[PDB]
Symmetry: C5
Subunit: 330 residues, 5 copies
Amino acid sequence: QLLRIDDHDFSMRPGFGGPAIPVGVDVQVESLDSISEVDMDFTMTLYLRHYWKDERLSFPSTNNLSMTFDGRLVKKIWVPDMFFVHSKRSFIHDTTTDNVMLRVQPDGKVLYSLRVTVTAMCNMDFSRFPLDTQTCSLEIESYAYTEDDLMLYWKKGNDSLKTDERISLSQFLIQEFHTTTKLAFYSSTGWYNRLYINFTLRRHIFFFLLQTYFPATLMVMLSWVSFWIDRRAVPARVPLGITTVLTMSTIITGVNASMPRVSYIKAVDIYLWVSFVFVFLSVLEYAAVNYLTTVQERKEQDTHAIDKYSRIIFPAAYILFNLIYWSIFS
Amino acid sequence: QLLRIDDHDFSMRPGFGGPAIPVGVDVQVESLDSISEVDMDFTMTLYLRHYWKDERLSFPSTNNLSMTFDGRLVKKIWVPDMFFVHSKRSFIHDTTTDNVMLRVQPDGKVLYSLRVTVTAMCNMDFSRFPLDTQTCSLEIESYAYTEDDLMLYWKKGNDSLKTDERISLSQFLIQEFHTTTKLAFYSSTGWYNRLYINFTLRRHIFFFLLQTYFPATLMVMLSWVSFWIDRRAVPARVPLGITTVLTMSTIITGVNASMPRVSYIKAVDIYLWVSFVFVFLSVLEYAAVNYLTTVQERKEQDTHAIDKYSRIIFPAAYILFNLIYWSIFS
Amino acid sequence: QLLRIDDHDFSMRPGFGGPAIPVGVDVQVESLDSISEVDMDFTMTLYLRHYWKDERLSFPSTNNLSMTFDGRLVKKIWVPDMFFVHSKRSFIHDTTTDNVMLRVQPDGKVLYSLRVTVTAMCNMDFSRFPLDTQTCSLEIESYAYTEDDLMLYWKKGNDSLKTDERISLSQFLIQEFHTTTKLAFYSSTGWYNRLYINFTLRRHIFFFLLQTYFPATLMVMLSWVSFWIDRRAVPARVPLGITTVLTMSTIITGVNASMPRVSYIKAVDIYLWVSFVFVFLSVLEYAAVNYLTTVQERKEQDTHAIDKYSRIIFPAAYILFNLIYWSIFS
Amino acid sequence: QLLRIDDHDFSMRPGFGGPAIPVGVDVQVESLDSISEVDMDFTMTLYLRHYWKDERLSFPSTNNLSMTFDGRLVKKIWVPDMFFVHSKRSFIHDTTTDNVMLRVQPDGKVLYSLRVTVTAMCNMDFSRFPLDTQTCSLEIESYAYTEDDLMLYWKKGNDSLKTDERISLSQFLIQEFHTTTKLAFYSSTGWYNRLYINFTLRRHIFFFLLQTYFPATLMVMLSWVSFWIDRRAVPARVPLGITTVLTMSTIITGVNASMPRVSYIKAVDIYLWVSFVFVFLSVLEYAAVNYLTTVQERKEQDTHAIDKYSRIIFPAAYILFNLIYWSIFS
Amino acid sequence: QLLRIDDHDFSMRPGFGGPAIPVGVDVQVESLDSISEVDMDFTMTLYLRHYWKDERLSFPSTNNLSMTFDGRLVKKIWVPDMFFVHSKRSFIHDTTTDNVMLRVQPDGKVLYSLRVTVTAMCNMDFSRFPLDTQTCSLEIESYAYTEDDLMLYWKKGNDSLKTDERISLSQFLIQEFHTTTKLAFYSSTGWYNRLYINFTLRRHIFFFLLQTYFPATLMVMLSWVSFWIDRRAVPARVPLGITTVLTMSTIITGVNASMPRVSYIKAVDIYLWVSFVFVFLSVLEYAAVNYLTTVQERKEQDTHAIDKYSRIIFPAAYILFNLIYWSIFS
Ligand SMILES: CC(=O)[C@H]1CC[C@H]2[C@@H]3CC=C4C[C@@H](OS(=O)(=O)O)CC[C@]4(C)[C@H]3CC[C@]12C
Ligand SMILES: *[C@@H]1O[C@H](CO)[C@@H](O)[C@H](O)[C@H]1NC(C)=O
Ligand SMILES: *[C@@H]1O[C@H](CO)[C@@H](O)[C@H](O)[C@H]1NC(C)=O
Ligand SMILES: *[C@@H]1O[C@H](CO)[C@@H](O)[C@H](O)[C@H]1NC(C)=O
Ligand SMILES: CCCCCCCC
Ligand SMILES: CCCCCCCC
Ligand SMILES: CCCCCCCC
Ligand SMILES: CCCCCCCC
Ligand SMILES: CCCCCCCC
Ligand SMILES: CCCCCC
Ligand SMILES: CCCCCC
Ligand SMILES: CCCCCC
Ligand SMILES: CCCCCC
Ligand SMILES: [Cl-]
């Protein structure tokens, strides 16, 4: 055997009982699988690499070049114990074998690689849905060793994060990948060092626009045509308002069937509910004209001024509301 | 080797055949995942810590400080056998390795930590839905050892429970974390010690109000516009009541399609069913006016008093019902 | 080592080549998780205990008391091989370790406990849905040993079954737990012994009543008010019947969207389909009156008798049908 | 030990380097779990038994009777390598232990049994849905050994297949179980022998009839009453046709929301789409009558013959179509 | 033993520290399970074969023929480390044992076969849905060895890919299977060689046509009947347009409820929304006639020209739009 595995005890870290051992980390992101709003999490697949030195793995050679081993020797040597903080579930691919790589230099330098899929929690705010921007992060930390025994740092500073050119999402836009570092404290174990991977997401508005705002505006404009019909055609102006109310209710239910039950109001609800009031007030206007006409004719025993005023009042108010709404929320 | 593992038989607990061995427990809660009403359970992620002493793991040193081992030595020494009572499923995270920590002091004190995710049953009452308050608990107990062989207690009394600052739920509010203790009895094995973790949850009423109560009140008020329309316009009052009835039925079905099939009446059912009776009587009110008009005119061969009374009778009754309902349920 | 594990071959049952070995069984039911109607199964969590004697496990002592071992010694001694018949899936809980208990007396008596979750098939008949009663059972049997090698029996007869006081179902009522025994035969292996656990379930009628029967009766009564409207009000009697038909069809679809596709008619189907027929004939009655009026007026060139008869005939028939239905099905 | 495991190498089949070894198979079917139309597969649970002889397992005895071993000795002896062809997923039950049986006769005959659950693909044709008949099969084959090294055959000819008396499907009828044999060829490995298990399935027509054909016929008959109403009552004949069209569209959508997106037309689609044309022609027929009367009145300035003809034309054509459809598709 | 497994160290590849070792690959595709549009992936099952030579496995014989071993010897010898790039999940079937074949020639040639199921990501374009054509591929690569240690190539060039004749999809058509080769580069490990398996898919248009385009055309043609009715029949022309608008909105919602939320407009979206505009303009046409009639009579105090022109204008425009649409997309 080239390596003297049987001559050492690998249940203790290198430099046991002494100074800490530095460990480097490199990360390459392969793809983002899915994003969930009800559960508030996301999925990511990446390659994780570790760098450290162990003098117990030295072997004699002349070329001074890295040598690759099959990978089943990992269960016989010491290996770091990194884990993902605030994760829900994760696994390692094992087809057709474990996706593990192990390269050892003659002096004792070791390279270790893995391929994992991780689901992690991300807190999102929907106060501007569906015109919002979200920020998420992925955290890496050692589980058993504190900063007094294991120091964790990025191998090459910012240049330690690589991304695939095929990363794409059908619903979002991904930008601004960067890495940071911070310390963590646990009340009963000690201090630990954390690594972060940050990115930003932006939503696409075209689908939501064409699927929600256009039908609502169409129904609102359809509600207006009743003002141009003679009041003597009783079975001609009530069905318009009734069907517009029904369609607005159906649209509201369909839109609300998707997002989770938050405790605050979203941007889309403001537009939909105001448009419901405009349609609702249309029915009341006709009832007022009908009642006034009956009272006026009773005392005695053309177009009324109410319709002529409404034909100009309603569109101006709707346009002003739309301008304000699209100026506030951009 | 620093530890003499092979020199002892670890199939027996320390102090075998003698007095019980005290074991301490510490718990830190990381996050609350989800809550289900159809299945009546919840998911939690936490860190579990154990404290005990074993003289067979003593090693000589001078600094008198804890030493950390990799973690694969756990399956070669004795370890407690705690489990979660009334759980549906659970697992231990194993990425990139088993989330296990092991620190041993020179005298023989041992620290053992784990990271687990548990789903546990919680019995909930929906008599005041959606203005109810729910209380749940998580139970920890030893499986194989009775009170005469293993004594279980909290390490620091009330101060043994810590919570993360990011624990939150989009639909519930979390409060009042505390711990208790109690004994349990099994008819064929003996007495055991149990530990409890208690918390309280409160719902948010904004979404339910805006999504259910407002449309029902709007429909009820819409049904009142038929009283101010002349009775000679037959195709002007029946469709209003018809569409209000259809909308109320659709709303009731949509609300009831989510909650489980309980055997008692909830608070939301009272409001929806009573308002359904008000809309139903609107159609019957029109029938009485129409029938009496025909009878009077036939014997013979302005506004009727029935509508004049109804216009004041209905809103007062509805307001009184709303006041009583919101006084009972606050 | 207190036990001489290495001095024997544990690949053979105790008393190999001789008389059969008795085995006892104790069961305690913890909870019932869920019940599925489309899949026709149920889920149960329980504790399973075995009692047998093996002289190869005897050890010297003086107190004559049971001694508890950790549980990893099970994989080196002989253990029975019970399994659940007609089960779809099952597993053993493994948090934080395998839920296994092992106690050995000095003479050789052994106790073995497990915690398992089992999903088993149950045949259900929905001819009286939703006023039906269902009976299900759970079966236990030895897989490899026949009655000539292993005898299976209840440890204490009837008193071998215990239930928790927290067992409950939101939609059913649990009662009448009891145990039986029966022999089984396989055409190519021999005779085996079986154990049974029986229980009964009863539904709750409040939800189904309030969700299905009341709206149908309300719609049927709504269809009756058209008889009190003058036939000259053409847009007053057709929309009522049309909307009642649409509502009845929607209710039928909603009810059928849950139960599986059985080959027989259910009790709830009879009540709904009869109601739809009554509403269907109401529309035809209006056409009969209208057609006769045109024919009568043509020859020539008040309330019709048909309506007067129907106003009394229809409610009596509906009440008679309801009385007969509620007397037959209790 | 009774068996000399350590004295032989079990990495080679019996008769290695020589003639092939015969292996017999017996199968008992326990239950059929479910059938999927969108995924086109089914689930089955069965017992699989193997028969062969190995002289290395001979042990001395005088009674000449089969002896049963616990089952953990399987991983130390040679065992066949059968697998299910065209399967999607499968597993072996392991509660409370692996469902494995092993009986060895004194001369060397071996019996080996397993309990497995298999999901397999079946190609189905829906040209006659829902009056179709489906035929599926399950295939068993050796993976690594060719016909020159392992000969596979049924142990007892036709009598090698047994079925439980509790096998039933809520929607299908099961009949005609039988077994066949055939050879298979792979372009780069050689020839293999296959075993088949065949059965037949038939559907139940009651649910589909009651849920689809009855409402469609009711709507078609309802659309016919418009020919018996006076044409001067304009708000009396249009809602009937419009609501029948809406109901037919809803029924078609509900029926189509289940079956997968096939590339051809199904039998149920023929009946529903033809009835849609009959209702559609009713609206156009009404429009033609109204236009002709207006033209006739303008030139000048009782029931029209078109309705009188239609009252006889429509029912006869519908009855003829029903007779043809129910004769073609039985 | 025939093979000297224990006499060598199999943690190093053949020719360790020297030239690369060629490896051949053969693939036979069994079936394609499903295709997902929301997740944009596909599932495939196949047999994977490897060819290489190792002198350490030589054994003496005279027949010079391949010898088959059971399959558990794989975990004691060196074996390649292939994996699937851009995959989501995968597994190896293990019923009733691991589906592994191992044949070794006397000189040292080794054959290794596996049966796996893989899910891979495919980027799809829905610009021409549902008249589009999709191209997907599957990638194979080595994980730990670079091109300087392991050379990967197809065993027989193009003739290394075989397909089963039972491969079929209910919604797609499969054609054009071929293989390619390309190099890959990672910034921190080196160069690797990849293999590709390409195929093409085409959709079936009959279902989408019959289910979406026919109802829309029927509704559009139905909306045209309002032009042949006299304008004095006021309650005859509005409900037709209103109900057609409602049906069109329902159809649009049903179509859009399935496809993912893309940022571009699909081919089916163009056809449906243009049809909605035609029906929408019909209501405005009726309003224009009604208003102008009142104005003319007031000044004063037969068929309108607008309807006469529209009866010819609308069908011509619809036919022209259909011709252009079906010419653009073929
Ligand atoms: C005076 C009349 O005779 C007209 C005037 C307004 C009309 C209603 C307007 C909207 C709808 C909703 C629709 O729901 S649906 O989802 O099933 O399409 C069913 C039809 C219905 C109830 C109409 C029925 C006919 C009217 C009462
Ligand atoms: C918390 O623990 C302390 C000390 O054990 C006790 O005095 C106090 O009552 C406890 N509080 C609660 C709410 O149980
Ligand atoms: C059953 O098997 C027997 C003997 O192999 C054969 O004669 C008979 O035709 C078979 N029956 C069927 C239905 O295949
Ligand atoms: C198949 O392979 C041959 C030889 O390598 C090559 O000439 C041919 O172009 C290939 N065909 C395709 C479709 O790649
Ligand atoms: C940035 C796109 C805004 C689109 C607004 C559309 C308002 C009708
Ligand atoms: C529409 C009724 C509103 C009642 C608000 C009550 C807030 C507690
Ligand atoms: C709506 C009818 C209720 C009948 C209740 C009968 C209780 C046995
Ligand atoms: C709905 C018409 C059914 C006619 C009887 C069919 C019997 C196969
Ligand atoms: C009803 C429209 C049919 C169009 C057929 C087009 C076939 C390519
Ligand atoms: C809890 C009973 C409330 C009744 C309100 C009408
Ligand atoms: C037992 C027959 C029930 C039928 C009720 C109408
Ligand atoms: C199979 C086509 C039948 C058509 C009957 C009119
Ligand atoms: C891409 C534009 C298509 C227009 C069809 C009329
Ligand atoms: Cl009308």
